[PDB]
Design an enzyme around this catalytic site. Structure first.
Site, PDB file in Angstrom:
ATOM      1  N   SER A 143       0.851  -1.172   0.000  1.00  0.00           N
ATOM      2  CA  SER A 143       0.000   0.000   0.000  1.00  0.00           C
ATOM      3  C   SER A 143       0.892   1.229   0.000  1.00  0.00           C
ATOM      4  O   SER A 143       2.072   1.132   0.349  1.00  0.00           O
ATOM      5  CB  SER A 143      -0.861  -0.015   1.271  1.00  0.00           C
ATOM      6  OG  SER A 143      -1.661   1.128   1.404  1.00  0.00           O
ATOM      7  N   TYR A 156      -3.748  -0.160   9.891  1.00  0.00           N
ATOM      8  CA  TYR A 156      -3.508  -0.511   8.492  1.00  0.00           C
ATOM      9  C   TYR A 156      -2.089  -0.136   8.040  1.00  0.00           C
ATOM     10  O   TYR A 156      -1.408  -0.925   7.390  1.00  0.00           O
ATOM     11  CB  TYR A 156      -4.550   0.175   7.610  1.00  0.00           C
ATOM     12  CG  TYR A 156      -4.528  -0.256   6.158  1.00  0.00           C
ATOM     13  CD1 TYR A 156      -5.010  -1.507   5.787  1.00  0.00           C
ATOM     14  CD2 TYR A 156      -4.053   0.587   5.158  1.00  0.00           C
ATOM     15  CE1 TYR A 156      -5.010  -1.912   4.472  1.00  0.00           C
ATOM     16  CE2 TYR A 156      -4.067   0.195   3.824  1.00  0.00           C
ATOM     17  CZ  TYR A 156      -4.546  -1.061   3.492  1.00  0.00           C
ATOM     18  OH  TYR A 156      -4.564  -1.502   2.186  1.00  0.00           O
TER      19      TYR A 156
END
Lengths: 257, 257, 257, 257
Positions: A143, A156
């Protein structure tokens, strides 16, 4: 030729829909045999139907990626029914958006367990057969949050930062056995779930365009080449590398007024 | 399909021999039309002969990459004789290995001029036509020295560190015009010039193996996939990215006793 | 104690005014003897007057940092008149903001020569005496542009990317002689030259606040601690490191709507 | 002055001995009031005795850093008995060295829970009072393994990679409330537990020297300046930054033969 996945078996975790399903499509088009899992039969069944509708003969299994015993059994079954896995894409994941001070430790831990611990579990499960057969690929879906932080995504970002180092570590530890472990780091990929954020000039749409040299959202097709590349023999000396596919976001200070 | 370079014109600077010539071979095999330059006619002539021996119809020009007026004229001529350049690989370079305290400023400056300023000059020269035609790729050959230092290579590391940021800047500045500018960072590639360092157990050979998870030197074939990938439409949302092709060196703390 | 610069001699290049002059103030307050240069006598004279007004007894010399012979002579003179230099801050620099396609190669080269080649020249000049005396610090003023690109600053980003690797290389090559070479990378520092960009809600002011977790512009005082830290014995095992002082910009994806 | 910790309260987790105890010593010498925890009373008691032997009046509490309810209660008690915490150092941790294929998922998870999830828990617990009082520092002890992998330390590298991104995220999310969250990344620090690896020429000792430009192991004193710096008002515009203290390891390709 070198970019072909003909004859290769790919397990893409969580690929009953979404980005994983799109990567699977690309892999199928490149010649790969598609294997996937999800946590409930309903998703696996619907996924298989969707693959059939596209002319793809996939193989779907019900397994929680956080369940090591289950994953070990799944891999054994895949070996029986399809063959030894050549390529693993750790794609299954969750995101929570919670201000850190409001986030229950149980919820932080869940994000970490699915997004970081589970890729370790599944990697561990596929590695013995990759090593034995003499070549393997493990591709971890990372990510922008493997590099940059933002309010509300502490768990996250921690998970994705960890996943980046797990990638480098697997590359380090198993490279000598001809395993290449790398990351794909998508930028902002436009999906139906974020369609309201692009309705017509939208503030958020403007924020994304201004952050991105390419001046557009990414697509799932944008990830097909990078994913096939890393799964293929064309990238056999790329190892421990996070390949960012973001239109230049991570390279750019941003469009200023 | 997406990895094909059919119909595309690629300028690879300095590709009369060496890594650049090998990248050109791969590009030719992928369907590209090959254009290259070198600083003297003798090298261009021999290069063209070598391309012909492989069945490649290349186009060679004599130009110093540090000579802006010359490069501008060369690009114009290429447009006349071959067509507008779709892909630029900035490959031409030198290395000096000199202890920094012993290195003349003129020699430091020369390394910078060829390895950093010249890629700017050539990028500037090809960009107008890429922008006008609606797509372009610029691939800068970087180095492990874009990230890590070593005694005796101060000028080279400074140049390659700079080239990494020039890459990110070109990506930033021209991304919106559908230019993708990226880097390739080779690890230790075995070439005839370093054959004595691999003669049989060699200390240096051991140093390289111990640094490398893949437990081997890289090859020029190892660079073919990464180079074609970055030149192709398969990487259209990869921008401002340095793709390291090093068997895991940059990911690994090293093999300890 | 460990953060004290008492007894140490610091050369800060270009410190007749601006960020360098502010770093010199901090160094003086920490006990250092201040030495600086600039390219013309008028600037050196005014700088010395400004130092005197603050009770700082500085030593100013006229020298172009791109002139190696001149810098070598300057260092020799400093050794005669003040003493051997313990700390070098490579601060002298220029910025040009020019769209890359409009930038003359001579102008690109000038930015590189002052911002990248000159720090090599001055580092080379001070190193022999640092090595001989048994300890030295070299602090290179880097930039956000050592990491991120932007339209119009290609030469500056290339230079600052290079300067980051020159830092790591000097650290690598001279570390064993007890030289610590590190970078300071300022974020957006508010200075009188950018006062119109903060006039009252200003679009640019908003862009900076949104990019910055700290939600403010940086100050020169923000750089004092980091600069003294890297010049002091408190950082003797920090080497080859770029210390970013940016309120979190490089850590943050940005404030979205 | 700006480097002083006078009047400030610092919680250093796990600081009953080792690197944390040494950081606490430095903080005490800089004027800080020392608070620490460990998982059993025996360690807390012995730690307090050791602090008393050095003339440091510390405050010790028994708490598992993975126990959120417990940590919340501990912080409340610290507020009652000492005052609001100005500085948190997340130091408590474990390392396991296990080949990844041999590592039980429970053991991987334990490393992650202590080294990654717990710093979130403790950060969350101290933040409300830091925000309310108008300034706070959170310093996360990272590792070379926040950047580089190695065989046998997959869980530790994943944790430390995660901790780096948790740092950047906390910086991002809480920067606007005048919280600075940064990392310290030690290199190879010589401690009694690794004394056999330095017995006299030792292969491992040679490996470390060859990797390190400074040509020596680090010490705990090497970490004192960096730790006090990041805890002090001298670093108020350093945020989301990992400060590596490694003698140049991360900057260097290594000493080759």
């Amino acid at each position: 030729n070198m970019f072909s996945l003909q004859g290769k078996i790919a397990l893409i975790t969580g690929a009953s829909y979404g980005i994983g399903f799109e990567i699977a499509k690309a892999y199928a088009q490149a010649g790969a045999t598609i294997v996937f899992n999800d946590i409930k039969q309903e998703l696996v069944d619907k996924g298989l139907a969707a693959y059939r509708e596209l002319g793809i003969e996939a193989h779907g299994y019900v397994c929680d990626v956080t369940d090591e015993a289950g994953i070990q059994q799944m891999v054994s079954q895949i070996e029986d029914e399809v063959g030894a896995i050549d390529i693993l894409v750790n794609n299954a994941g969750i995101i929570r958006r919670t201000p850190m001070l409001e986030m229950a430790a149980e919820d932080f831990r869940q994000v970490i367990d699915i997004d970081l611990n589970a890729p370790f579990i599944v990697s561990k499960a596929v590695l013995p057969s990759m090593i034995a057969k003499g070549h393997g690929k493990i591709i971890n879906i990372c990510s922008m949050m493997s590099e940059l932080g933002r309010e509300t995504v502490s768990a996250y970002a921690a998970a994705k930062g960890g996943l980046k180092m797990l990638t480098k570590n697997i590359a380090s530890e198993f490279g000598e056995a001809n395993i290449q472990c790398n990351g794909i780091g998508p930028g902002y990929i436009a999906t139906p779930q974020t369609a309201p954020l692009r309705e017509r000039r939208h503030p958020f749409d403007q924020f994304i365009i201004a952050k991105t040299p390419a001046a557009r959202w990414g697509t799932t097709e944008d990830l097909a080449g990078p994913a096939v590349f890393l799964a293929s023999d064309a990238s056999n000396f790329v190892n421990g590398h996070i390949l960012y596919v973001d239109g230049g976001i991570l390279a750019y200070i941003g469009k200023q007024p």
